[PDB]
């Protein structure tokens, strides 16, 4: 009854778009709910976009409301645009995580500022738990799906006012109730915006180091909260911003390590990295396969420039949970595509891509 | 299969927002159904806003229709804005009550002026009972959820043309059919706008005395309709309008006792009172904990100022009906927040809060 | 598996509104589908408004389209306004009938002019049958629900170009396929706009004589298509137009017999008649109880004036099919309420009333 | 579980409209998704319009977006207008095919240009296969429903950069997974826009020759992918453009053979042809019955001018899948009708007609 990943991950030799973002810009229709910090998560039947709403479109501008500073989490079926008719308001929240365990949705949101920040957890209809900042706040949820295995759901929560002394904990939940937690030893790094997937009883997450690294730190942990934090050992940093290519080593890429943006590394053998085409602008998106894994020298084989010029933002994992034909576990990612509008600035729309077990041509989806 | 409350109510050390009203104001979208006399009630998976429609928005002003005087009850999933696409017209009615017994919805509405006033009851999609005013009318339902236990649903019905000569009955329904009713001895008082909850085969309601009390009368009764009406024994009335603090006693507070607004007191030990921040205006909302209970002298311990400057209105209880994890009974409340709009007056929107068994910081939800 | 009415009709002591029409007028929101020839019919769960669409509203005026002359049948859930989001286009058609037999919807529509007229029938998704005019056409369906008994559904179909030489057949269908039909002997009269119900596995229909009667002819028939056409033996015609009150006989009332409008008579004991408040215009609506039946002298006990001043139009029967509580078969009617608009003329909205076997007051629902 | 057509096709003596396209033009409502390359396909309860969206309506004009060049496949229930609330984005694609096998939808889309072109396949909610071009691309799906028999689904895929050297293959899928394919010998012809149906475990398709024929080539094949390609042997070409009548023979009609539009021939005995009324413009639509089959001399018996002056476009087969009642297999077709708008050019809307077993009169559906 509780979901768990299929026994092995599908071989990944390509990536195909299953959903392009709605093609808004320079104009968009009215009564659209404008979203940020969006991500994807699925029940056993279909997938949804979870997001924080910050405005509603009206004649190309923003309806004058308090939506921007009264922050609430919404969800919309992936195949629909986010409008008042198609989107459901779930809880108030500035950051969030959500995941379906096979029976019910567990949803976490963070509210309040600094020392007042607290997290609440909902399982189904029911608020089941809360906890407050303990290292100064704000508490921060990763804005990517949490990970459920056989009824236990895991999420990374971050605390602390400064990226140079952040605190990161794994929380284990059951029926929306904290069972235990483990504070990770992250001395010398920062680990925000965890995006994760699960395979053979392991949870693997990619972080974003906003302090002193342009490589993305990686976390591997078990259902028992045993863990290891790992550094990519190639010479191609994947955060944005970042410096240029370097000699492969397991060392941090400190050139332009400050700042960053949510992103992912498929931490398997082969591994896949993902990054902007250019180190100079947040444009394009490139997927590269590293057969010997992320802790090898990083020699690339397959390479796919999914976008060249389109402006791209945050990205992260989600996993289909109800496949019937596939005997192996599929892996997908979501990716913000940024569009310029005439009357309310830069918007982002999520597209989604899933791994396939066959190679395809190096199609450019810029269109 | 019929819902029943848990044997004892959860500890409440704090209140967190589960739904902040849709953030309309100064502008709001077109084709919104404007609501009044709203309250919240839930089935096993979702919560709904039940309300009387009084108009439709159109380009920031009111569409010219008969909606305000041809009154009908609607319901909207709490997480959706009320539009013609998301809201369902249930029955015509000037006042109402609704509750889910585990299988189907019981809905009661009152219609008619003075002596011709009558109440109609629906169970699922079927009209199942009616009854007429017995004391001159109009019949008034409380505009807060009715209370179901083991398939019996209970609601306070009021009658009589004046507040100084009002009559109030507990009606028990099963399958939308009146089983019995009991007329309360309310001589000397007035008991409008009952808002109730249940635990352990007890039902507790907070009333509003529109005649001669600025404290709120309380009612406790059993499934078998044995009851007592009791008066708060502190010195801080919680109706609006009201006078200032006085010496604690079990006596009514007649200073500014005339008039009032629907509100609630959590009648447990500890007890929780709720009220506007000051007697001078309908601004803010404050929750105060009284460890020794509402019939004690009223010494307060915990105190939360959930709102300071936002204008607030009606408030009442609701109980989520899908609680599968908690061993104890949770409690929540809904609350009108008033906002000014550019072109159709002051609107009301429901926010909801639920009690949690741990404290949180004294957050002000004004912004 | 197939629906049949409950063994006995509920006693009808009064009539209560279950749905007041949407209170549009003088203005209406945009994107409403404007409806005519509407009626109500139900599945085992809920009820739908079936109608021929003739336009779409846009800023108080009609969008400029072909909708008025390319006529199509739609349905909308009764609790929803008819919008592009809530309404479903079923089949093209200028008149129609629909009924749910417990498993699927049977829908009939007529198309074409005079000699070219044909009817098609849908059962579920599938078009199951069609037939052509036999008497010069146009074929005309009654714009009221057809009548299903244990998987056989019955509908009255009218043919013939002249009202003084009309032809009427009872058609019996199963699974949307015509099993048999029976031509009625209606020489001397005209029997359009049949509106029917069933009980004691009899079908009873009220007609509209557009030729030479201000009284309404009545039809009674069995599953074997044995039948009786009967005239009301009171002196109070219920059609419109109509002449003045007169002497109780079983004689037609030729006075202002030409023309007419769809209406109903509860052909039981007691019987109920229904008509505008008075003969001069189309205002109000009056329900009158005749204990001895419609073939008696026609003396009235109860007289409920449901509307006094509101302008009213077509009316007809519908039967709830999924009642779980009532052991007896309920009976309802739909009724056109006409409202004037600022920019697109007179519109019609359906109200629905249901009989109750409990008490009710003589409330007027005009204001 | 799996769908299969009956052993015999129902008798067609007539064609009646089951859906007249939404009657837009000269005006249309806002927030409508505009469609191209649309076709109809059904599951067990409902029929859907599948289409490639190219824009969104706003105040009579095209919203300024990237929708025309970022092409995605959408699906709308046939009885709803395509809006943001009623339409579902399925997959990115420039052409597509879809079909329901009794359990799930199989959906194919083609993306990329020339050598990068590839098709991807979804079965239910899961991507299940992909394949690439064999002759330089682009791969082209026929934009009409694929054909499922007993769980095996068949579709024609076309390849190659020039109509004078096109390649065409039958692909057989099961569970959205390619089982096998067969490249057809189409030397000397071109076979685009296949529109197909099934009867008695055969598949029949009508192609469009864009190279050198104004007659339409026909394909017939078995589940085992044994096939024959045939030429109509009458003297009346049905492609558009086309020349005039000729002496009947089995030879290609090369006058004005270049170019074409998707269309159908019912390849039975009797056979039915379909074409524009006018030879030199795309106006009207005429269905002609040829008793001795499409390989006969072509003598026409029944003839129906369904449209005279309406501008018409693509047309193709679909087969309703809920047909529980009939013992014979029904056949329908969809057809583009084009209308002029005030502010955004020609739009096309699909109408649908189904073959019925009874004759009807020669109705003109222009009005
Ligand atoms: C691939 O298909 C080619 C085309 O076939 C045709 O189109 C395809 C789409 C299908 O519809 C087929 O059913 C069609 O046949 C094949 O090439 C054609 O082959 C036919 C013979 O089968 C040739 O027919 C000939 O026509 C010329 C006049 O243009 C005459 O020499 C003669 O016409 C006959 O007409 C009457 C019969 O109806 C007789 O009374 C008369 O005496 C005479 O026999 C020929 O039959 C046709 O010209 C070819 N078309 C083209 C474009 O090349 C091709 O099959 C054959 O190719 C031939 C050249 C020949 O060598 C055969 O041995 C090949 O098998 C196939 N390829 C394969 C492997 O099957
Ligand atoms: C808390 O983690 C600290 C940092 O560890 C590194 O970063 C983490 C985010 C994670 O990725 C982890 O896996 C990774 O190692 C620990 O401090 C580090 O300890 C390692 C040894 O395990 C040191 O490695 C040494 O470096 C010298 C340099 O000359 C080499 O000779 C050789 O490589 C050697 O192994 C790291 O230098 C050190 N990093 C820092 C910033 O201090 C820390 O564990 C250890 O702390 C050090 C100072 C030492 O006293 C050990 O005995 C401690 O275990 C860890 N804290 C705990 C309690 O485990
Ligand atoms: C066909 O029906 C006519 C009229 O029937 C009357 O109105 C019907 C709508 C229905 O309500 C019937 O119940 C009514 O009787 C009928 O002709 C009528 O017959 C009655 C005698 O039974 C006369 O009183 C009445 O005046 C007469 N009306 C007219 C306009 O003719 C027919 O019944 C009889 O008609 C007479 C003229 C004879 O032809 C006789 O053989 C026949 O029974 C009826 N025709 C048939 C074939 O049954
Ligand atoms: C009917 O009720 C009156 C009022 O009782 C009080 O107010 C009620 C709303 C409820 O809160 C009761 O519990 C209160 O006691 C009763 O009259 C009072 O009786 C009490 C003693 O029992 C006395 O102290 C008060 O002064 C009385 N007040 C008045 C106005 O006389 C009365 O006893 C009840 N009648 C019956 C039939 O029991
Ligand atoms: C929104 O409206 C308010 C109220 O009039 C006004 O003060 C403010 O300038 C507006 N803000 C924006 C974002 O335009
Ligand atoms: C970490 O960064 C913050 C913000 O720039 C700074 O104020 C703080 O002092 C830093 N910590 C130290 C001690 O370097
Ligand atoms: C979670 O709740 C389910 C009831 O749905 C229960 O069976 C299970 O034991 C619970 N797990 C824990 C440890 O809370
Ligand atoms: C609404 O329209 C009515 C009828 O035309 C008119 O009497 C009135 O002025 C309007 N009401 C308002 C408040 O504008
Ligand atoms: C309501 O009615 C049903 C019969 O339809 C009966 O089985 C059930 O016990 C009743 N429920 C209650 C709460 O009385
Ligand atoms: C609708 O538009 C048509 C075509 O432009 C035009 O002939 C007509 O004037 C319009 N109809 C009305 C009543 O506005
Ligand atoms: C109607 O359909 C039902 C269900 O398939 C079937 O049992 C019955 O035989 C059908 N009746 C006729 C007369 O077609
Ligand atoms: C095929 O068509 C192309 C495009 O028109 C043309 O350039 C080429 O010459 C043609 N080839 C032959 C052999 O007909
Ligand atoms: C398609 O899936 C069904 C359900 O598992 C299965 O019965 C069938 O064998 C599958 N077909 C193939 C080609 O494996
Ligand atoms: Ca960084
Ligand atoms: Ca009982
Ligand atoms: Ca008061
Ligand atoms: Ca037939
Ligand atoms: Ca008449
Ligand atoms: Ca493959
Ligand atoms: Ca051609």
Structural domains in chain D plus CATH codes: 1-367 (2.120.10.10)
Contact assignment for B65 to C362 by CB distance below 8 Å: no
Which ligand is nearest to the Cα of residue B211, counting in written order? 16
Cα B289 to ligand 16 centre (Å): 22
D361: number of Cβ within 10 Å: 16
Q: List all residues 6 or more positions away from A315 whose beta carbon is below 8 Å from its beta carbon.
A: A195, A262, A263, A264, A274, A285, A333, A334, A335, A336
Point out which residues pair with B224 in neighbouring strands: none
Do B217 and B191 contact (CB within 8 A), yes or no?
yes
Do B215 and B237 contact (CB within 8 A), yes or no?
yes
Chain B residues touching chain C at CB-CB below 8 Å: 30-31, 56, 58, 63-67, 69-70, 72, 84-85, 88-92, 111-112, 115-118, 120, 123-133, 175-177
Omega before C38 within 30 of 0, i.e. cis: no
Point out which residues pair with A49 in neighbouring strands: A40, A76
Say how far apart CA C345 and CA C341 lie, in whole Å.
Answer: 5
Say how far apart CA A121 and CA A93 lie, in whole Å.
Answer: 11
Mutational pocket test of ligand 1: of D170, D188, D206, D209, the residue with most ligand atoms within 8 Å of the beta carbon: D188
C316: which 2 tokens? 């007809």
A188: number of Cβ within 10 Å: 10
- In 3D space, the residue among D128, D127, D125, D181 whose CA is nearest the CA of residue D158 turns out to be D181
A211: which 2 tokens? 């302090």
Contact assignment for A89 to B83 by CB distance below 8 Å: no
Say how far apart CA D142 and CA D52 lie, in whole Å.
Answer: 13
Token pair 């309920």: residue: C330
Q: Closest chain D residue to C125 measured between Cα atoms? A: D45
Cα D256 to ligand 1 centre (Å): 23
Pocket residues for ligand 13 (CB within 6 Å)? Answer: D 174-175
- In 3D space, the residue among A267, A319, A318 whose CA is nearest the CA of residue A295 turns out to be A267
**How would you class D46 by CB atoms within 10 Å of its CB: exposed for 0-12, middle for 13-18, buried for 19 or more?**
middle
- In 3D space, the residue among D195, D128, D136 whose CA is nearest the CA of residue D161 turns out to be D136
Distance from CA of C160 to the nearest CA of B (A): 41
Say how far apart CA B56 and CA D15 lie, in whole Å.
Answer: 45
Cα C186 to ligand 19 centre (Å): 69
Residue owning the nearest CA to atom 10 of ligand 10: C64
- In 3D space, the residue among D243, D250, D247 whose CA is nearest the CA of residue D217 turns out to be D250
3-state secondary structure of A116: helix
Do A300 and A235 contact (CB within 8 A), yes or no?
no
Cα B253 to ligand 16 centre (Å): 9
- Which of A28, A79, A322 minimises the CB distance to D89? A79
Chain C residues touching chain B at CB-CB below 8 Å: 16-20, 22-30, 45-47, 77, 79-81, 83, 85-86, 320, 322-326, 330, 339, 342, 354, 356, 358-363, 365, 367
- In 3D space, the residue among C274, C271, C264 whose CA is nearest the CA of residue C297 turns out to be C271
β-pairing, C61-62 with C72-77? unpaired
Chains touching C, CB cut-off 8 Å, 3+ pairs: B, D
- In 3D space, the residue among D184, D157, D174 whose CA is nearest the CA of residue D97 turns out to be D157
Say how far apart CA D364 and CA D367 lie, in whole Å.
Answer: 7
Say how far apart CA A363 and CA D318 lie, in whole Å.
Answer: 33
B215: which 2 tokens? 């404290």
Q: In degrees rounded to 5, what are phi and psi of residue C114?
A: 30, -110
3-state secondary structure of C114: helix
Contact assignment for B30 to C29 by CB distance below 8 Å: yes
Point out which residues pair with B143 in neighbouring strands: none
Say how far apart CA C195 and CA C238 lie, in whole Å.
Answer: 14
Experimental method: X-ray
Do D356 and D13 contact (CB within 8 A), yes or no?
yes
- In 3D space, the residue among B351, B357, B330, B197 whose CA is nearest the CA of residue A120 turns out to be B357
Q: In degrees rounded to 5, what are phi and psi of residue D156?
A: -90, 125
Q: Kindly calculate the radius of gyration of chain B based on its CA atoms and give it in whole angstroms.
A: 19
Do A111 and A118 contact (CB within 8 A), yes or no?
yes
- Does B189 contact ligand 4 (Cβ within 6 A)? yes
Distance from CA of B18 to the nearest CA of A (A): 5
Say how far apart CA C110 and CA B65 lie, in whole Å.
Answer: 35
Ligand 10 atom nearest D342 alpha carbon: 5
Say how far apart CA A264 and CA A205 lie, in whole Å.
Answer: 8
Point out which residues pair with D168 in neighbouring strands: D158
Do D319 and C127 contact (CB within 8 A), yes or no?
no
Say how far apart CA D190 and CA D53 lie, in whole Å.
Answer: 27
Do A53 and A67 contact (CB within 8 A), yes or no?
yes
Point out which residues pair with C130 in neighbouring strands: C120
- Which of A67, A84, A120 minimises the CB distance to B23? A67
Residues D20, D21, D23: CA angle, nearest 5 degrees: 100
Say how far apart CA A245 and CA A265 lie, in whole Å.
Answer: 17
- In 3D space, the residue among B325, B13, B350, B197 whose CA is nearest the CA of residue A130 turns out to be B13
Distance from CA of B202 to the nearest CA of A (A): 22
Q: List all residues 6 or more positions away from A336 whose beta carbon is below 8 Å from its beta carbon.
A: A38, A312, A313, A314, A315, A348, A349, A350
Do A226 and A220 contact (CB within 8 A), yes or no?
no
B116 DSSP 8-state letter: G
Contact assignment for C66 to D23 by CB distance below 8 Å: yes
Could you tell me the CA-to-CA distances from D5 to B15, B359, C175, D14, D245 in Å, in that order? 61, 66, 19, 21, 35
A196: which 2 tokens? 């994760």
Token pair 């009532």: residue: C326
Could you tell me the CA-to-CA distances from D91 to B121, B188, C83, C318, D121 in Å, in that order? 47, 70, 27, 44, 9
Distance from CA of D220 to the nearest CA of A (A): 30
Do C117 and C132 contact (CB within 8 A), yes or no?
yes
Omega before C270 within 30 of 0, i.e. cis: yes
Omega before A270 within 30 of 0, i.e. cis: yes
B357: left (phi over 0), alpha (psi -120 to 50) or beta: alpha
- Which of A20, A326, A330 minimises the CB distance to D92? A20
Say how far apart CA B354 and CA B360 lie, in whole Å.
Answer: 12
* Resolution for this experimental structure (Å): 2.0
- Which of D56, D84, D116 minimises the CB distance to A361? D116
Q: In degrees rounded to 5, what are phi and psi of residue B323?
A: -60, 105
Residues B89, B93, B94: CA angle, nearest 5 degrees: 130
Do B328 and B8 contact (CB within 8 A), yes or no?
yes
Q: List all residues 6 or more positions away from D161 whose beta carbon is below 8 Å from its beta carbon.
A: D114, D135, D136, D137, D138
Do D176 and D229 contact (CB within 8 A), yes or no?
no
Which strand ranges, in their side-by-side order, compose the sheet holding D126-132? D95-100, D105-111, D118-123, D126-132
Q: What are the DSSP calls for D93-122, one per residue? A: -SEEEEEE-SSSEEEEEEES-GGG-EEEEE
Do D15 and D292 contact (CB within 8 A), yes or no?
no
Say how far apart CA C28 and CA D38 lie, in whole Å.
Answer: 33
Q: In degrees rounded to 5, what are phi and psi of residue A164?
A: -90, -5
- In 3D space, the residue among D31, D101, D23, D110 whose CA is nearest the CA of residue D67 turns out to be D31
B300 DSSP 8-state letter: -
Q: What are the DSSP calls for A66-101, one per residue? A: STTTS-EEEEEETTS--BTTT-EEEEE-SEEEEEE-
Question: Using a CB-CB distance cutoff of 8 angstroms, which residues of chain A are in contact with residue D127?
Answer: 16, 18, 354, 356
Q: In degrees rounded to 5, what are phi and psi of residue B75?
A: -140, 145
Residues A159, A164, A169: CA angle, nearest 5 degrees: 30
Say how far apart CA B44 and CA B52 lie, in whole Å.
Answer: 23
Give break positions in chain C: residue before each, C–N beyond 2.5 Å.
none
3-state secondary structure of A247: coil
Do D97 and D105 contact (CB within 8 A), yes or no?
no
C22 DSSP 8-state letter: P
Say how far apart CA B77 and CA B85 lie, in whole Å.
Answer: 11
**How would you class C237 by CB atoms within 10 Å of its CB: exposed for 0-12, middle for 13-18, buried for 19 or more?**
buried
Q: List all residues 6 or more positions away from C301 whose beta carbon is below 8 Å from its beta carbon.
A: C270, C289, C290, C291
**How would you class D159 by CB atoms within 10 Å of its CB: exposed for 0-12, middle for 13-18, buried for 19 or more?**
buried
β-pairing, B283-290 with D346-356? unpaired
Could you tell me the CA-to-CA distances from D175 to A85, B205, D145 in Å, in that order? 33, 58, 16
β-pairing, C167-174 with A61-62? unpaired
């Amino acid at each position: 009854f509780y979901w768990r990943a299929k026994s092995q991950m599908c071989e990944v030799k390509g990536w195909v778009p299953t959903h392009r973002g709605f093609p808004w810009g320079p104009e968009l229709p009215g009564d659209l709910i404008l979203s940020r910090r969006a991500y994807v998560s699925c029940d056993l039947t279909s997938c949804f976009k979870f997001f924080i709403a910050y405005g509603l479109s009206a004649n190309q501008h923003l309806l004058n409301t308090s939506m921007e500073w009264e922050e609430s989490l919404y969800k919309t079926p992936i195949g629909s645009a986010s409008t008042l008719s198609t989107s459901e308001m779930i809880l108030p929240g500035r950051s969030s995580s959500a995941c379906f365990d096979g029976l019910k949705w567990t949803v976490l949101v963070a509210n309040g500022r600094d020392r007042n920040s607290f997290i609440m957890i909902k399982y189904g209809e029911e608020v089941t738990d809360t906890f407050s900042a303990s290292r100064g706040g704000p508490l921060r949820l990763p804005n990517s799906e949490c990970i459920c295995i056989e009824g236990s759901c895991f999420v990374i929560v971050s605390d602390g006012p400064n990226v140079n002394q952040s605190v990161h904990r794994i929380y284990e939940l059951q029926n929306g109730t904290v069972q235990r937690w483990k504070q990770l030893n992250t001395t010398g790094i920062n680990f925000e915006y965890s995006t994760c997937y699960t395979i053979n009883n392991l949870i693997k997450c990619t972080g974003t180091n906003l302090w002193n690294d342009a490589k993305r730190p990686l976390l591997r942990f078990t259902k028992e909260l045993n863990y290891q934090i790992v550094e990519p050992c190639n010479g191609a940093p994947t955060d944005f911003p970042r410096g240029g290519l370097t000699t492969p080593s397991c060392k941090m890429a400190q050139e332009k390590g400050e700042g960053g943006i949510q992103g992912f590394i498929l931490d398997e053998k082969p591994a896949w990295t993902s990054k902007t085409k250019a180190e100079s602008s947040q444009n394009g998106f490139v997927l590269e396969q590293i057969p010997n894994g992320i802790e090898s020298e990083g020699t690339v084989s397959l390479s796919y420039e999914l976008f060249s010029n389109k402006r791209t933002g945050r990205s992260g994992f989600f996993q289909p949970k109800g496949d019937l034909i596939s005997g192996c576990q599929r892996i997908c990612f979501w990716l913000e595509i940024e569009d310029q509008t005439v009357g309310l600035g830069m918007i982002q729309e999520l597209s989604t891509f899933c791994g396939i077990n066959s190679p395809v041509q190096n199609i450019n989806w810029d269109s």
